[PDB]
Amino acid sequence: KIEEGKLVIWINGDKGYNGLAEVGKKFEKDTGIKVTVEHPDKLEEKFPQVAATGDGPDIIFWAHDRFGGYAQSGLLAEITPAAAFQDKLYPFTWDAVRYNGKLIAYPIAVEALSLIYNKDLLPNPPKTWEEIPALDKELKAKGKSALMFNLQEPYFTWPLIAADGGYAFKYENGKYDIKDVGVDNAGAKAGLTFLVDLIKNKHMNADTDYSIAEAAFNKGETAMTINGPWAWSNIDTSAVNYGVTVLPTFKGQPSKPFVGVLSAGINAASPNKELAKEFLENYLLTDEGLEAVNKDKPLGAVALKSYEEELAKDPRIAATMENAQKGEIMPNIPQMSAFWYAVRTAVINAASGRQTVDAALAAAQTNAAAGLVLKGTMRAHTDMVTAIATPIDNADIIVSASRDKSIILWKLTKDDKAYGVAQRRLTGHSHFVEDVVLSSDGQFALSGSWDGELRLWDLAAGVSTRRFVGHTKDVLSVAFSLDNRQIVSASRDRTIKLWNTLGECKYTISEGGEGHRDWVSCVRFSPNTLQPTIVSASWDKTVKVWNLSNCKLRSTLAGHTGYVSTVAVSPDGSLCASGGKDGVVLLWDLAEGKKLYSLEANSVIHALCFSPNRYWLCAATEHGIKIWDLESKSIVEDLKVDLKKVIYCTSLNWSADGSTLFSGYTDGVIRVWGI
Numbered sequence: 053k054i055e056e057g058k059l060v061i062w063i064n065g066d067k068g069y070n071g072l073a074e075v076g077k078k079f080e081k082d083t084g085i086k087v088t089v090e091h092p093d094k095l096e097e098k099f100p101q102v103a104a105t106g107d108g109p110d111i112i113f114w115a116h117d118r119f120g121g122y123a124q125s126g127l128l129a130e131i132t133p134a135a136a137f138q139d140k141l142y143p144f145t146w147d148a149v150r151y152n153g154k155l156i157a158y159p160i161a162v163e164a165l166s167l168i169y170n171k172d173l174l175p176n177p178p179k180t181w182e183e184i185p186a187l188d189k190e191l192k193a194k195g196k197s198a199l200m201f202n203l204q205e206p207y208f209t210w211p212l213i214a215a216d217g218g219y220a221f222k223y224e225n226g227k228y229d230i231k232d233v234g235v236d237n238a239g240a241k242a243g244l245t246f247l248v249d250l251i252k253n254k255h256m257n258a259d260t261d262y263s264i265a266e267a268a269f270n271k272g273e274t275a276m277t278i279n280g281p282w283a284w285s286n287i288d289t290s291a292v293n294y295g296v297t298v299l300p301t302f303k304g305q306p307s308k309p310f311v312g313v314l315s316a317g318i319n320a321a322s323p324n325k326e327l328a329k330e331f332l333e334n335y336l337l338t339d340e341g342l343e344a345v346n347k348d349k350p351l352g353a354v355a356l357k358s359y360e361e362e363l364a365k366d367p368r369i370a371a372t373m374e375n376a377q378k379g380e381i382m383p384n385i386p387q388m389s390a391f392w393y394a395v396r397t398a399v400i401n402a403a404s405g406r407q408t409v410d411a412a413l414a415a416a417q418t419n420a421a422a423g424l425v426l427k428g429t430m431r432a433h434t435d436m437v438t439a440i441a442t443p444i445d446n447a448d449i450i451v452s453a454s455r456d457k458s459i460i461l462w463k464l465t466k467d468d469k470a471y472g473v474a475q476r477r478l479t480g481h482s483h484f485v486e487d488v489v490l491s492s493d494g495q496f497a498l499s500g501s502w503d504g505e506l507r508l509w510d511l512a513a514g515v516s517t518r519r520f521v522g523h524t525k526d527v528l529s530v531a532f533s534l535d536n537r538q539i540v541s542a543s544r545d546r547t548i549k550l551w552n553t554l555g556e557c558k559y560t561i562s563e564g565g566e567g568h569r570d571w572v573s574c575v576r577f578s579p580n581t582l583q584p585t586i587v588s589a590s591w592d593k594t595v596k597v598w599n600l601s602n603c604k605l606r607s608t609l610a611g612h613t614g615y616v617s618t619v620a621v622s623p624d625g626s627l628c629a630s631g632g633k634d635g636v637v638l639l640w641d642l643a644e645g646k647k648l649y650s651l652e653a654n655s656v657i658h659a660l661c662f663s664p665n666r667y668w669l670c671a672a673t674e675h676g677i678k679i680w681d682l683e684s685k686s687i688v689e690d691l692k693v694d695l696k697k698v699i700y701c702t703s704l705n706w707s708a709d710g711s712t713l714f715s716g717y718t719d720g721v722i723r724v725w726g727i
């Protein structure tokens with residue numbers, strides 16, 4: 053629920069949540085309000101989840117870099133401190149938490165990684181990364197390692213990658229270009245390669261995580277480690293005689309860590325937005341509040357000036373700020389998480405050996421800039437997935453058709469396991485199922501296969517309820533009339549047939565001069581109820597529009613030099629996209645019945661479909677799923693397949709809400725796309 057009357061706070065496990073808890077107890081004393089401080093695992097990922105449904109904590113803590121994404125998804129209440137309060141914090145700390153001109157959280161402290169060394173094992177720490185391999189050989193002889201730090205999180209490896217040129221998003225004229233990603237340039241490659249070499253020459257292991265490196269350093273086994281201010285406590289209790297100094301340089305350049313600003317945001321759904329502000333502003337952001345947290349685990353250089361005046365006296369803090377100066381404050385734009393996930397994968401694969409540096413970064417480069425990504429994969433078909441149907445009511449299930457001769461009802465789980473599971477496999481056709489469609493109910497499926505027949509399926513009971521025997525050759529397409537009372541099909545027998553629901557052919561648009569002269573590959577109903585019509589693709593290179601009332605030919609659309617294997621109709625029934633052999637997508641004006649323009653794809657098109665919302669046109673091509681913006685006539689996405697044989701999309705269909713693109717491939721795998 054909401055939890056009106058108390059304050060649920062979330063902060064990371066590596067921070068002084070106990071000290072904060074104290075602050076919470078002090079608030080409760082003066083307020084009479086219970087403060088609960090919890091530190092869930094992966095709280096940064098759960099938050100956007102729970103906050104979306106209206107649940108979650110009242111206050112969430114994390115480095116600023118992740119708040120832009122939360123704000124964007126409306127998960128954060130706008131904060132508005134009095135000018136008096138604002139002056140208490142450094143202006144630059146406020147900028148860290150300012151998104152689209154608004155303050156979305158209270159800044160707490162400036163975090164920056166530093167080189168932490170054991171003064172007893174290494175009086176003079178290396179000034180450069182390059183002298184570390186020799187240093188490790190020297191220490192290894194004495195049963196000690198030179199360096200150990202968390203190689204699992206990109207946060208720790210980024211300072212070295214960025215050192216000689218690597219960057220996340222190009223910054224220019226006071227703005228970030230989210231398409232200009234710098235993770236695979238010469239600089240980033242040089243840094244990651246050096247790192248990987250360290251692992252190859254065994255100066256550090258690819259599996260070293262946070263606890264391993266912290267234990268090793270605190271137990272005096274390794275001379276140096278890399279960490280933030282929050283680690284100084286544990287080392288204190290370990291009695292190690294350490295120092296905190298400038299990170300080593302690489303190729304003469306200083307390591308450039310991404311600087312985080314620990315921040316506290318208030319849940320958009322919280323019913324204690326006021327209690328939250330009173331707490332953060334009058335209890336936490338005070339010389340007392342911070343000191344209570346700082347004693348638990350150091351915060352770093354705090355936003356609050358008054359208290360920073362004391363902290364800046366600590367040399368470890370001065371060292372923190374020197375490394376901070378060599379790097380830069382993290383952007384808070386939504387793309388940051390994509391950048392982090394991208395870089396994390398790259399480092400791990402390059403480190404594990406699964407991929408080469410160039411290989412790993414190249415992919416990271418793509419994932420960091422990627423808009424539409426691979427939300428998941430659904431596997432069950434043992435052969436090519438020929439068609440995909442999505443429920444009109446946007447329910448949590450879809451249906452697929454495959455050359456394995458079956459259709460599958462998928463239950464969209466989304467759970468870590470898979471995006472969906474084969475809830476029921478329906479068999480019955482004696483040859484490849486080429487196309488499938490759902491009823492308005494979303495309760496029945498209508499299929500067409502190369503066995504020349506169509507079948508109605510009762511999805512719930514799992515059985516075929518009707519065979520449509522009429523065509524004399526392979527059936528290549530099927531469609532349901534808007535009111536689901538009429539069924540249409542296309543065949544290699546060059547005809548288009550109309551059927552009722554009882555399996556009787558009510559009408560046949562014969563191969564006559566009016567009809568097609570070759571295979572009819574596709575037939576679709578136009579959503580327009582004013583002029584009942586259907587369009588048809590054909591290997592006779594034409595497209596035909598038909599009056600559903602009298603079944604009379606409206607018009608023949610010529611413009612293709614090869615077979616047209618597919619046709620899609622805009623949701624409004626005004627446009628119509630056609631495609632096939634010649635690689636060009638012709639967009640027509642249904643109403644008038646004339647060409648509007650082309651859209652080169654340079655690849656054979658297999659399927660088409662417009663977006664439910666956006667002015668988008670998607671094309672299943674042998675060279676990826678091309679997506680143009682019907683307004684700019686420009687490509688906005690070109691999705692290829694990466695297993696890390698020629699594999700290509702044969703079918704695709706959007707979820708009713710336009711949020712997910714389902715697509716079948718030749719390898720029998722169904723790939724889910726979306727934000």
Ligand SMILES: OC[C@H]1O[C@H](O[C@H]2[C@H](O)[C@@H](O)[C@@H](O)O[C@@H]2CO)[C@H](O)[C@@H](O)[C@@H]1O
Nearest residue numbers: 066115117118163205206207208312392
């Ligand atoms: O490395 C990916 C990860 O880096 C940062 O998380 C830091 C955090 O800022 C520090 O305060 C401390 O908790 O160490 C974390 C690394 O494990 C980013 O803030 C985070 O968004 C990103 O995923």
